[PDB]
Design a binder for these strands. Structure first.
Length: 289
DNA sequence: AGCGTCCAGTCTACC
DNA sequence: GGTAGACTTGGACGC
């Protein structure tokens, strides 16, 4: 992907943007901390930074950042290096995905922080999106570090070291419920060095699954989401109830277990299963099931 | 009405 | 070996 990048004032401008849409990306069910501003731009808190992203045609405007942070953080965050046009063309050979793609032509898989993704999807279990978004912002406000942008105070996502000194009940004050003990166990295990997140990409996909599932409250799904949305292993297909029913209704025309639904997609899509999972998800929400 | 009953991945208990 | 039922918080839907 070829872009013309320039620093201009307190913002960074990227021209030559393709296969990208803010609304579609931030509402594909992968992230939770990005919110729409009145002009249609999005403000979010990731990697201990607060930025506003705005897309005007093929021009991206990232406010409150510098050329150092753009290449070090945001280039890889929005996965700008990858060609989604080739991915869309390849997947479109299946007629079901072609129909799914036309509704989400701008979905890109974000490369989010390992720790935030882990805790975010620990919170996601048996939980609707609006509540997940609320609990995460509670954790941020309660235990995060304050940063300001345009007069308003925003909060970073709490690190493991910033969570270990609190009891379960204190964590439970974020309205997370029974999930509090899982967050407490997750924070304890990373803080002790018992689970290394920086070196986690060195292991195979199956090894990573096993490493993360050692944390109480992390099963296959949470582990899969961390693997896809944070590690960037795209040959995975994280199966939630929604995608199960989407793959059921549109392909097999029967009913299935999360295991066989998963093995059907990885077989059919291969190294592009993660992208396919995104197009079907947003298409699933667009059709209303 | 307002009060109820159901439900949005993982663990635990028990096969 | 496998899974049914419990699980916080809270919003939807019944009558």
């Amino acid at each position: 992907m070829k872009y013309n990048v320039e620093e201009k004032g307190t913002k960074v401008i990227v021209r030559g943007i393709a296969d990208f849409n803010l609304k579609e990306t931030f509402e594909s069910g992968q992230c939770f901390r990005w919110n729409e501003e009145e002009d249609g731009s999005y403000t979010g808190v990731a990697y201990d930074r607060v930025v506003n992203v705005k897309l005007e045609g093929d021009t991206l405007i990232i406010d409150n950042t510098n050329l150092t942070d753009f290449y070090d953080i945001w280039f890889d965050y929005f996965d700008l290096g990858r060609d989604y046009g080739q991915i869309k063309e390849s997947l479109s050979k299946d007629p079901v995905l072609k129909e799914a793609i036309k509704f989400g032509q701008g979905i890109r898989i974000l490369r989010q922080d390992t720790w935030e993704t882990l805790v975010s999807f620990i919170v996601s279990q048996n939980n609707r999106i609006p509540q997940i978004k609320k609990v995460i912002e509670n954790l941020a406000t309660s235990f995060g570090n304050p940063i300001e942008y345009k007069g308003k105070i925003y909060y970073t996502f709490p690190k493991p070291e910033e969570l270990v000194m609190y009891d379960v009940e204190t964590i439970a004050k974020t309205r997370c419920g029974f999930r509090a003990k899982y967050i407490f166990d997750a924070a304890s295990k990373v803080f002790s060095g018992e689970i290394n997140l920086l070196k986690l990409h060195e292991y195979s996909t199956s090894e990573i699954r096993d490493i993360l599932m050692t944390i109480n409250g992390v099963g296959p799904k949470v582990a899969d989401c961390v693997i896809l949305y944070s590690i960037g292993r795209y040959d995975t297909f994280p199966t939630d109830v929604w995608i199960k029913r989407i793959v059921e209704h549109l392909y097999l025309k029967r009913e299935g277990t999360p295991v066989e639904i998963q093995l059907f997609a990885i077989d059919k899509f291969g190294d592009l299963s993660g992208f396919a999972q995104q197009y079907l998800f947003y298409y699933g929400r667009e059709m209303g099931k």
